[PDB]
Amino acid sequence: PMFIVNTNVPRASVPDGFLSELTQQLAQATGKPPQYIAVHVVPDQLMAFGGSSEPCALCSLHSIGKIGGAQNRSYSKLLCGLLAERLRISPDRVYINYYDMNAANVGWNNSTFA
Amino acid sequence: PMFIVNTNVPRASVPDGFLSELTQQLAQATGKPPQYIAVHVVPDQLMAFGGSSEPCALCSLHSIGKIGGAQNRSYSKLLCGLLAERLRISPDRVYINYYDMNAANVGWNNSTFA
Amino acid sequence: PMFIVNTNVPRASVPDGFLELTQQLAQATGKPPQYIAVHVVPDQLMAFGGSSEPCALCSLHSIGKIGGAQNRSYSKLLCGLLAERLRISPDRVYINYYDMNAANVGWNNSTFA
Ligand SMILES: *C(=O)c1ccccc1
Ligand SMILES: *C(=O)c1ccccc1
Ligand SMILES: *C(=O)c1ccccc1
């Protein structure tokens, strides 16, 4: 799995330990070993949400399975929770796109997961 | 709906009001209220299009519906038009990937749109 | 086709000539290089398996030319380039492949449909 957050929150407002926290919480949530979890935070972005430049985030979570109705609500509560606590972003200013990838469409270590 | 543009155009060449113009024009084009629209511009990128580093843009539009043949042609004319006028990017050096997201696969405000 | 690589490798470690990717993608996909778009994003705040050693998160979008065997080939190619040029271990690279419908790719005021 792999989680990306793009935000207008400045770099200095991202707490040390954030990428580790996301890695551990995502490992717990998805039931996958942390060794497979990739996380990426992109601060200082030029963005707007509803026409406002108040803190916001545009995120993605890609997984091979483990994507679906109830699971995605649970991930949203988790990830919005983290972004609110750690980056002070309102949950109503967060979008998270969820992608259920086919194993043949994820490359890794010179091959794919197929 | 949500629109992202990555470009090699420098930040100083992004005019004031650009995010807001995107927001307003996307609201007009998609019909959706502006308060839902997210926009994101990433200048100063290291990119090439057809092997050349002349101004170019790689973009995405995600929407829950309101994606299809004619709609996407209309969006492309709109967006290419804005990029040409405001960032001086030739339309033939713009790619826009369109994504029709399932509501269950879009997180927002501690829950999804399903 | 379009290829995007996001990496914590610093900008100074991306060698001259790298945006090589265009040529090699043209060759791999059997498409003219005029169609190929490439984007490299260095200096990123990222981890892979909880480590901040060099890593990359990438995407390849194509209108067709995506599938089992093809994607393995693309991955050997691309991981090879990332290892040689950016000193990223192949097991610290993910590449998401997307088979786009022509109607869902915009270009030159219209789409490819
Ligand atoms: C996680 O293992 C994963 C899933 C999809 C893309 C990348 C990583
Ligand atoms: C807009 O409401 C929207 C649609 C799809 C993904 C993100 C935002
Ligand atoms: C290649 O021509 C291509 C570029 C953008 C999206 C899909 C394919």
Describe the structure.
Three copies of one chain form a homotrimer. Chain A has helices at about 20-30, 70-85, and strands at about 1-5, 40, 45-50, 55-65, 95-100, 105-110, 110. In chain A, the strands form two sheets. In chain A, strands 2-1-4-5 form a four-stranded mixed β-sheet, with helices on one face. A two-stranded antiparallel ribbon of chain A has the order 6-7. Chain A is built from two helices and seven strands. In chain A, a hairpin with a 2-residue loop joins β6 and β7 (about 110). The two termini of chain A are about 15 Å apart. Chain A has about 110 residues and is of the alpha/beta class. The first copy, chain A, has one domain (about 1-114): Macrophage Migration Inhibitory Factor (2-Layer Sandwich), CATH 3.30.429.10. Chains in contact: A-B, A-C, B-C. Chains A and B meet through β3, α2 and β5 of A and α1, β2, β6 and β7 of B. β3 of chain B pairs antiparallel with β2 (about 35-40) of chain C, so a sheet runs across the interface. One benzaldehyde (HBX) binds next to β4 of chain C. Chain C: GO terms for molecular function: chemoattractant activity; cytokine activity; cytokine receptor binding; dopachrome isomerase activity; identical protein binding; phenylpyruvate tautomerase activity; protease binding.
How are the SSEs ordered, and which strands pair?
Three copies of one chain form a homotrimer.
Chain A: E1 2-7, H1 18-30, E2 38-42, E3 46-49, E4 57-63, H2 69-87, E5 94-100, E6 106-108, E7 111-112
Parallel strand pairs in A: 1-2, 4-5
Antiparallel strand pairs in A: 1-4, 6-7
Bound molecules: benzaldehyde (3 copies).
One benzaldehyde binds next to β4 of chain C.
Binding site for substrate (chain C): 31, 63, 96
Family (chain C): Belongs to the MIF family.
Subcellular location (chain C): Secreted; Cytoplasm
